[PDB]
Amino acid sequence: GVFSYEDEATSVIPPARLFKSFVLDADNLIPKVAPQHFTSAENLEGNGGPGTIKKITFAEGNEFKYMKHKVEEIDHANFKYCYSIIEGGPLGHTLEKIPYEIKMAAAPHGGGSILKITSKYHTKGNASINEEEIKAGKEKAAGLFKAVEAYLLAHPDAYC
């Protein structure tokens, strides 16, 4: 069982530069688009290319929250980046995984780019998702992706 949600940003930066930039700022997404919510991200197993698992720590509240991420695939020839949450208390109730898909995307002007952001939410075994995890899911995701957007769009120094 699967649900999905998405958003798309823009930049004066061309795709191949924004590519290589987002790759180096991927673990940096966590504090810069969800600052209060996560507490740390940590490299668990693998060398930082796709395949690599991260151990993730998230907010206090009688018991601090636990997850694991993994980088999943990266391509230049169609300019994509991918990760998923593999494990955690935030999945455990109904979800196998929440994958993410990112595109550095051709703009109608060839000198700039679009930066597309995607998330998808997949159930544990043959189960059904919570409508409460849909409603939380997309809307926490407007929280994430409008801070990806206003991070990108409100970046003042992009002429460099």
Beta bridge mates, 83: 71, 100
CA angle centred on 26, ends 21 and 27, rounded to 5°? 135
Alpha helices in 9-157 (DSSP H): 15-23, 29-33, 89-92, 131-153
Structural domain count, the chain: 1
* Strand extents, DSSP E, 13-160: 38-45, 53-58, 65-75, 80-88, 95-106, 113-123
Domain that holds residue 50: 1-160
- Identify the bridge partners of residue 81 per DSSP, sorted by sequence position: 74, 102
Q: Contact, 75 vs 16, CB < 8 A?
A: no
The span from the CA of 90 to the CA of 92, in Å, is: 6
The HSE-up count of residue 151 (CA atoms within 13 Å, CB side) is 19
Rounded Cα gap, residues 120 and 136, in angstroms: 13
3-class secondary-structure state, position 4 = strand
Amino acid, single-letter form, for residue 45: E
The whole-angstrom distance between residue 42's C-alpha and the CA centroid of its chain comes to 15
Alpha-carbon distance values, 156 to 11, 27, 39, 61 (Å)? 11, 22, 27, 36
CB count within 10 Å of CB 150 equals: 12
d(CA 2, CA 82): 17
Q: Half-sphere exposure of 34 toward its Cβ, with a 13 Å CA cutoff? A: 20
Find the DSSP H helices in the chain: 15-23, 29-33, 89-92, 131-153
| Alpha carbons 130 and 133: distance in angstroms, whole number | 5
Locate 21 and state its tokens: 């930039």
Method of determination used here: NMR
Burial class (CB in 10 A: 0-12, 13-18, 19+), 87: middle
